Amino acid sequence: VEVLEVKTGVDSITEVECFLTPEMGDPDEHLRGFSKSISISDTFESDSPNRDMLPCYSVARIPLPNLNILMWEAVTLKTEVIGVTSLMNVHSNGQATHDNGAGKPVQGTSFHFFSVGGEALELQGVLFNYRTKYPDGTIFPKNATVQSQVMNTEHKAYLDKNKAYPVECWVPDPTRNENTRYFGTLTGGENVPPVLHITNTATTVLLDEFGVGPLCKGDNLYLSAVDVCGMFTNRSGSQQWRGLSRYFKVQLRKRRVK
Amino acid sequence: EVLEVKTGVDSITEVECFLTPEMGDPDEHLRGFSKSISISDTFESDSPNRDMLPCYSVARIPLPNLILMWEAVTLKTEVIGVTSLMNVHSNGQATHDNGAGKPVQGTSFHFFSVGGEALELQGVLFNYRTKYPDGTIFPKNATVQSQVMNTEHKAYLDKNKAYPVECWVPDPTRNENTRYFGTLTGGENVPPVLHITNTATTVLLDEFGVGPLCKGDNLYLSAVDVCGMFTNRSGSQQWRGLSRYFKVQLRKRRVK
Amino acid sequence: VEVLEVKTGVDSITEVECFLTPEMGDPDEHLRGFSKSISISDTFESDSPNRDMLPCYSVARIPLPNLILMWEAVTLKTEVIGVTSLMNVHSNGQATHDNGAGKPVQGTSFHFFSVGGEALELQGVLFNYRTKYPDGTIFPKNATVQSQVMNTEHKAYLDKNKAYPVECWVPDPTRNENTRYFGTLTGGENVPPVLHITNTATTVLLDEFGVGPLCKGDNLYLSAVDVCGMFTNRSGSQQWRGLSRYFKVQLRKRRVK
Amino acid sequence: VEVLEVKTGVDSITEVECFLTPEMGDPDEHLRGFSKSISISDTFESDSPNRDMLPCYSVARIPLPNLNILMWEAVTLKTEVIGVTSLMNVHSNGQATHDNGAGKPVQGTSFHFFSVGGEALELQGVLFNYRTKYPDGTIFPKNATVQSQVMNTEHKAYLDKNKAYPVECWVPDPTRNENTRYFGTLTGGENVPPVLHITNTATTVLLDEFGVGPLCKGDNLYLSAVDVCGMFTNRSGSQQWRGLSRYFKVQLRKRRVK
Amino acid sequence: VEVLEVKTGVDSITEVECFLTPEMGDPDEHLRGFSKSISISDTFESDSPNRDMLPCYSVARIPLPNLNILMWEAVTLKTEVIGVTSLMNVHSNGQATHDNGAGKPVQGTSFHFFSVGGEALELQGVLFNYRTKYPDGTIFPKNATVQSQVMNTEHKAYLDKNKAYPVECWVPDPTRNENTRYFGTLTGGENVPPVLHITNTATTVLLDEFGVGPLCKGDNLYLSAVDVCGMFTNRSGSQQWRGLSRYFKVQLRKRRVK
Ligand SMILES: CC(=O)N[C@H]1[C@H]([C@H](O)[C@H](O)CO)O[C@@](O)(C(=O)O)C[C@@H]1O
Ligand SMILES: CC(=O)N[C@H]1[C@H]([C@H](O)[C@H](O)CO)O[C@@](O)(C(=O)O)C[C@@H]1O
Ligand SMILES: CC(=O)N[C@H]1[C@H]([C@H](O)[C@H](O)CO)O[C@@](O)(C(=O)O)C[C@@H]1O
Ligand SMILES: [K+]
Ligand SMILES: [K+]
Ligand SMILES: [K+]
């Protein structure tokens, strides 16, 4: 792909705007945005998480206006987590911080992640415990060995399906993703406070050091996200992951390629 | 069609004010506080009383009567009364035997916006089965999808003491004519960190050099400043809020 | 006043250097820099703190060389003096755990300073409007429930030492055009003090038009609060601990009409 | 070396891309990336850690295209920790946060370190306790004295072997390392949260204040890392170090020297 | 003195490189870098710390090449705490974090300080408790009064001797020190985590707003430091300060003065 000039004229720019909903596991008809309560295996080899207990990566493939060689080039992103204030509900059968106190808020381990590319996000598998038995309906690292706990280059995938790729098994592959820009933060620890900023005044530029943004193959834009905000603690002490949706607004321009 | 800025004597004005918090005000002595928080016995029976729910604050400020429109260019803002949180002697729960009272701390939301029309809101519910109380304006026809995103839940922040903080956020798909800024810091032991200074200015211009344009010569200011919770001797906890200062500089802009 | 040109020449600059001591309550002859130990009221309505339990704003009015020309404050260097004293964890403190060192000063802090050409202007805000503030302090009068969020009756000048309780008053953002102020409240009973010292950091006091505070009557006003946190005694009782603040201000002569 | 001009043209640049795996101790065939459970000596004089309980520095010597005077000059680095999301496995034989709660995540003391150089990283030994008996198979400060607890200039070494130099005994020698760029952060304390950021948009420039990067002696590039993320607590309360792999991508150019 | 031009030519620059060891109290022949265990007086009045329980400021006076009017002007500083990874020894007579856990790492109150000057650092005394009895062998504020607890201007000194000036009763005097640059941070609290960064890529410029660095009177450079990293808790629960050495590299140039 030899990248040539940007087209100008009213015809030459478009914008994509949407929200990606979280895929936390949704253990029943009332619990969209939550996982199943977390249970702990008695040994590493008996770790066998249920599908509804595992947060997964969210992905949307967004069709763009048909171009054909011109390709749509992603230039800027505005993004934010939607519903941050819902975490102020400390009255809905939570565990009291102390006698007569309010409910404990969502807190603990979080992962906030987003990416914009001209093709599916490329993944590398890394396992906390290579003996974990991942459940039917998920897509997970296969032929796992003990080396999979640090780096096994067999574990390559594309984030090409929703509700499928568990967050804990997969990360962006830094050896690939030439045509994607990704950003993520893991903040670990059972008592970590969510710190969630919102504003409509912040923009991320998606251009690389050569002035080129992701180029959308087949006129498809790929957006991916994870927003595990922490865990909700019920009155009983049981804990569930809670996630939130992520807003994306991407500005694209037409670029000629050879 | 946004054209040139007017210059000269007549061409600039300034709005200054304070927005008071709306934390619930459970009796005649408790302005700035919510009712003590109670916890539902089950998830599906969540039913908070009105005076236990902090709400968004809003003020519509009339501007000098003027096509010209007032354009909001700069903002200075801060929380007013930060030091009041040093009152650790007013029947609080002692940190330990013979200790001082626990200060206000825990989950906070600090938010402000400036716009030329009402802030546009999107509803998101922690629990879609929460029964919100009479006197509040809340997401209607809630479904389980309301827990992550239900696009039916659209509203305007057009009334005080009405829109609960926990149900609503700025709608990022709208608000083209508003600039908003907010931070949620969650967790029961989070410390308030509150900065004051008269030397900091936020510029409200967009990337094209245009600020919010004030329709009908009105400026919209919105805020939430839930600072955390106060813990009483008994262990019961109430939200505590503070007022927010706004100073906005505006200039006359021609529009076609 | 029209602000005209800065005067130049050897004669045209001056410098003020001083320290402001903290006013934490000083409950006896050995406890300068500390408050009285904190007591908690039995009911919310009966809150009635003693004067020696209430830290106050510090202020100094500094006379400048006699001079229309006015002295214009241009820069500030400032820092908290005696930060290392907080390493004394061996003086009648409460042990962190069995056999452990004493708990250091920690918890709620307020660090504040201002430089102006007239007294700092204050606005009152009350945690609890039914608090009975003690004789010898200057506090918001005619308090109502609105005073818990905003009652514009409560206006004052920081014009006296050992008088204006920190917990009652903040800088009035609707005034103070001729002062620059800066403060941080860090609340919570376990927050760690984080105190930086250096002689290499300068704050510029000029506004967006390039004009600094202009000293009316050739007086410079400096104000400070440095409540570093609470010291916990062996018994568990807790006292506020404050420290002094250094100020160095550079000033220049400015013509006005 | 007198440093002269940079060569230009198609042939004048090369890139190195790889991952360094962590060397945390690997106490059995299922625990790659973990140390042995930590045990505590009764006294300073009886401190005698086993080899599998001691994380070590990772190092790779990467041969570069043969040049001969020209040398490869390292100019930029992209790096990130691989597998950050694996730390969201809070269901695999971990100690519950509280009754009925999720497993505690990896947390506590961490050391994140990386270096890029034109020769081996130079190390200086500093011991917490000079009377520690370091185990067979490790390379550790020899002839330790009480002065070794603060600075004993005898303890000089090169990071020239994997699985050998314990992290707790050695630091980069600030008095040397003119031909290396190193960066590290120790965050100590039993409850500190991991905060791990990932993105493919961040580059570190390796040039010094004269515009000169590490110069690769004998056409070898040396990459070194430690990423001790914290400790994993199992259900019994025992704690093990957990580490992760680090990705490196280094761009190099040819430089003439005299 | 009037500061005139900088000298140029290869003769005109010099460099000082050294390390300053910590002086934490060194309670016996095996505990270099540690204080004595910390004990607590029953009253303010009875506060009487042992010499070996009191960390002190470190100082080195470094002779420079003889000049004579020319003076050496200090222009840049690179500095680093040496041995940060030693704090990963959590297996040496430490108190377990919980049953079967690892040892508690060094944590709690820290003071990290350094200065570079052309004369001795000027100190001002401030006492936590003016009735504290400072021990024989230390140099402390004399004629203390209750005003010494906030500011007593009688308490002036020069940092002109090692193992002498206790950290807790002296600070840099901001009313003096025109010919020194100093930097320090106190982080207080019993559980605060050490956060220690190391790199050889960071330089501090020592020039003031007029482009003039410290001028070395009598061809002597003064380096001062404190690096109290926190406290080590042994198995009994007793606590000792732990310090580390600090590296300095200072670049100087010849300046003419009148
Ligand atoms: C948000 C919610 O629904 N919480 C409820 C949970 C979850 O439904 C399940 O744990 C999901 O797996 O179930 C409980 O029996 C429990 O574990 O204490 C009651 C609790 O009120
Ligand atoms: C600030 C305040 O008023 N605190 C009081 C509260 C609140 O009035 C209610 O909780 C409001 O809902 O009532 C108490 O009975 C309580 O809960 O312990 C006594 C306490 O002193
Ligand atoms: C630093 C100090 O002086 N501590 C003493 C305090 C204070 O003098 C008062 O609390 C001031 O109000 O008084 C005690 O009775 C206490 O409260 O435990 C004894 C303690 O030794
Ligand atoms: K690649
Ligand atoms: K839009
Ligand atoms: K060197």
Which CATH class of chain A is shown?
Mainly Beta
N-end to C-end Cα span of chain A:
6 Å
Strand tally of chain A is 14
Beta-strand percentage range of chain A = 35-45%
| Multimeric organization | homopentamer
Rough outline of chain A: globular
CATH architecture of chain A: Sandwich
Largest sheet of chain A: 5 strands, antiparallel
Can you write the helix and strand succession of chain A as a string?
EEEEEEEEEEEEEE
Write the CATH homologous superfamily of chain A: Capsid protein VP1,Polyomavirus
The percent range for helix content of chain A is under 10%
- Which ligands occur here? N-acetyl-alpha-neuraminic acid, potassium ion
**Count of domain modules of chain A:** 1
The number of helical elements of chain A comes to 0
Find the structural class of chain A using helix and strand composition.
mainly beta
Family (chain B): Belongs to the polyomaviruses coat protein VP1 family.
Organism (chain B): JC polyomavirus (JCPyV)
Main location (chain B): virion
Protein name (chain B): Major capsid protein VP1
